[PDB]
Structure 1
Amino acid sequence: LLDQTSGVPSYFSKGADRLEEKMSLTVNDPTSATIYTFMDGDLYIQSTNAEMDKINKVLA
């Protein structure tokens, strides 16, 4: 993140930080965004094409 522009007064000087948002996998975490649901390790529902909540609400 330090300035690496050659030949400037702010060379190697500290600057803006960065917000890093790393995604991680979880089981029965209510805060997480659910992607799959299982019963006794069998898959509960399928889909293949791209999901969109408000398109379900229009089309159904």
Structure 2
Amino acid sequence: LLDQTSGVPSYFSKGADRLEEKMSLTVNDPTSATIYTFMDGDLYIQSTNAEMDKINKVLA
């Protein structure tokens, strides 16, 4: 992230920071965005193609 033109640590090298957003997989955390649901180790509902909640609400 330092200054690439200089390429060495210096008083002027430091600049802006970066916001990193890594994704991790959970089991039963309610705050996380659910992607799959299981019942006794068996898949509950399938979706063969793209999911779109508002679009599906209109189509229903």
Match of 1:18, SS state, is strand
CA distance in 2, matches of 1:23, 1:36: 16
User: 1:7: how far off?
Assistant: 9.0
Q: Tell me whether 9-18 or 41-50 shows the greater mean CA deviation.
A: 9-18
Distance 1:24 1:15, change over 3 A: same
- The normalised TM-score by structure 2 is 0.86
Query: How many residue pairs align between the two structures?
Result: 60
Structure 1, unpaired ranges of 5+ = none
Q: What is the alpha-carbon distance in structure 1 between the residues aligned to residue 17 and residue 42 of structure 2?
A: 44
Q: Deviations over 1:17-37 (max 9, x none)?
A: 000000000001000000000
Structure with the higher strand share, 1 or 2: 2
1:46 Cα offset (Å): 0.3
Q: TM-score, normalised by structure 1?
A: 0.86
Structure 1 runs (4+) deviating above 2 angstroms are 6-12
- What is the aligned-residue RMSD (CA, Å)? 2.7
